[PDB]
């Protein structure tokens, strides 16, 4: 069905860094854009749904926005905690898919 | 409040059905109107959506399993179980129910998985 | 409701879209106020009656 | 704006397509070296800089080499990393005479396509009002080229 | 009616660039002929020229 591509694969960045993720989607999904932060030995926390809007509990250093087929996280003033694989949701259509991961390593 | 918890038998072997269970705490299964998913992943591999059924017996899965799985659900128990026939090496992964909530919105309701269960790992071998 | 366009239509697309929003939060907008302001007066009206 | 008088199609599409671009990277496609089969050092007073004819910066008006004007052919595969923007256009000389002392052929097309795309155009060769000094028109046209597509 | 049969039709302004041909062709009758005139048309500005 609509196949999500994320970039970058990886990310170095030091505490008080400000990074970015991208999601690139195959189709047109209109603002459906979930991002999901996957600690190890954890299921996926939601972070950002409907493309920019924080999940309850979620630091305000996480943001992100986006528009149909390409979508921003942004991660600023990283900290030691923010240690993961962010992954990119699709919910348009039934046959839900995911990007790959992009795994991010905080110094 | 909501919690999902998850069991199994961990091991199946080859060509066996691989049989798990979704016990919903804090959130009425069959009252919420809510949609049910099933997700896993495999060793080195990122997430893989498995399908999903609605309050009510509708159920949908992902087509690349559309020959070998199956969803169902228990309002009694408040529980969901999925099932795999044949089930190989590539089956080897940790599983996850999790729960499918919304945003109304210009395009639709916006969908998103707020409660995820800690999920299990099945292993396939001989 | 539902229109399709081509990739050649975007200004009308994004019209099109731009209408449809703009009217849904128009009445979005009036169905929420209507009930948040009749809310306020059917409250106020029991009171009042009572009194 | 143009320089040389003439005309943008879908130039409106084009300037809403510009509100969701934060970048360009720009990319050169098709080197001007490439085309050793015609001349790509023309140019007009209308576009001049300092007194010298010139053009616009970011395109080659292919023009005859010598006595003739072979096929001109080119192509990109956009392994760029992302859809890429690319402009092109058609020259409208206001005579045959023009036609014939830039190009030599005067049933002349340029055809421009993709896996979407699907175009072809003639000249219109006559008498039009000077623009800037110019009877000529220069008409330019767009096309977005997607991911590992071929223009 | 014109002797020639690849025939065109070419207007233009300072802004106008248009060039037609003939489509001859038969088609049903209306008003009792088989032809089609078609129009079109054009604002001149200001001292510009046709
Ligand atoms: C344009 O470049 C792409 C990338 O190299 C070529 O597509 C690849 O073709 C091979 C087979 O020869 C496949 O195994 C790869 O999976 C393809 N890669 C991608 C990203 O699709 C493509 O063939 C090239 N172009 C043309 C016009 O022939």
């Known amino acids: 069905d609509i196949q999500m591509t994320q970039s970058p694969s990886s990310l170095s960045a030091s505490v008080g860094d400000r990074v970015t993720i991208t999601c690139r989607a195959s189709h047109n999904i209109q603002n459906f854009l979930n991002w999901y932060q996957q600690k190890p030995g954890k299921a996926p926390k939601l972070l950002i749904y409907a493309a920019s809007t924080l999940q309850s509990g979620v630091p305000s250093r996480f943001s992100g926005s986006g528009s149909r087929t390409d979508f921003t996280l942004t991660i600023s003033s990283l900290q030691p905690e923010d240690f993961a694989a962010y992954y990119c949701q699709q919910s348009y259509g039934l046959p839900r898919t995911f990007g790959q991961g992009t795994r991010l390593e905080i110094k | 409040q909501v919690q999902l918890r998850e069991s199994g038998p961990g091991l199946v072997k080859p060509s066996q059905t691989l049989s798990l269970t979704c016990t919903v705490s804090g959130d009425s299964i069959s009252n919420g109107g809510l949609y049910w998913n099933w997700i896993r992943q495999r060793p080195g591999r990122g997430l893989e959506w498995i399908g999903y059924?609605?309050?009510?017996?509708?159920?949908t899965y992902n087509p690349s399993l559309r020959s070998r799985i199956a969803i169902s659900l228990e309002t009694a128990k408040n529980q969901l179980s999925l099932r795999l026939s044949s089930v190989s090496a590539a089956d080897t992964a940790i599983y996850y129910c999790?729960?499918?909530?919304?945003?109304?919105?210009?395009?639709?309701?916006?969908?998103?998985?707020?409660?995820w269960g800690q999920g299990t790992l099945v292993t396939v071998s001989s | 409701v539902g229109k399709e366009f081509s990739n050649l239509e975007r200004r009308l697309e994004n019209l099109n879209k731009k209408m449809e929003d703009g009217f849904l939060d128009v009445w979005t907008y009036n169905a929420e106020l209507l009930v948040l302001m009749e809310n306020e007066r059917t409250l106020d009206f029991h009171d009042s009656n009572v009194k | 704006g143009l320089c040389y008088p003439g005309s943008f199609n879908d130039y409106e599409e084009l300037k809403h397509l510009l509100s969701s671009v934060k970048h360009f990277e720009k990319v050169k496609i098709l080197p001007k070296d490439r085309w050793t089969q015609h001349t790509t050092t023309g140019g007009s007073r209308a576009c001049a800089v300092s007194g010298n004819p010139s053009f616009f910066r970011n395109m080659v008006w292919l023009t005859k080499k010598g006595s003739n004007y072979p096929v001109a052919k080119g192509s990109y595969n956009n392994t760029s990393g992302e859809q890429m923007l690319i402009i092109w256009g058609v020259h409208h000389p206001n005579d045959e005479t023009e036609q014939r002392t830039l190009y030599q052929n005067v049933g002349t097309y340029v055809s421009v396509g993709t896996s979407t795309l699907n175009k072809r155009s003639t000249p219109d060769i006559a008498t039009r009002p000077k623009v800037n000094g110019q009877g000529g028109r220069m008409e330019f046209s767009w096309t977005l080229l997607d991911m590992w597509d071929t223009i | 009616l014109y002797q020639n049969v690849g025939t065109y039709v070419s207007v233009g302004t300072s802004t106008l660039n248009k060039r037609s041909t003939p489509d001859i062709a038969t088609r049903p009758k209306v008003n009792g002929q088989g032809g089609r005139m078609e129009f079109s048309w054009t604002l001149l500005d200001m001292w510009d020229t046709i």
């Open positions: 059924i609605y309050y009510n017996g509708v159920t």
């Open positions: 999790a729960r499918e909530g919304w945003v109304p919105d210009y395009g639709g309701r916006n969908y998103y998985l707020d409660f």
